[PDB]
Amino acid sequence: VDCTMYICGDSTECSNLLLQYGSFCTQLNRALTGIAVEQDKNTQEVFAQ
């Protein structure tokens, strides 16, 4: 999920207000990328041996 698009539907003002919260969207995106990498590693370990 794209945090900015999910929180604000292409609203510049909403994005600006969300920016005041910090870097929560970046952390969530990093967590999702790590989850995807973990899934890829899991399937590689399960099958590619």
Partner: protein, 49 residues
């Protein structure tokens, strides 16, 4: 994109791999509006002429 990835990874050197930098989207040209066909008009003829 090399400099973009350098900004993303907080370093001047980036290792070989894949990294997410940002997101992309397009914008509406101006707008579009669609309304139903004009129905029968009010008989203003018998009122005016």
């Amino acid at each position: 994109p090399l400099s973009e990835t350098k900004c993303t990874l907080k370093s001047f050197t980036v290792e070989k791999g894949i990294y997410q930098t940002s997101n992309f989207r397009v914008q509406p040209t101006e707008s579009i509006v669609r309304f139903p066909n004009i129905t029968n008009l009010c008989p203003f003829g018998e009122v005016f002429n």
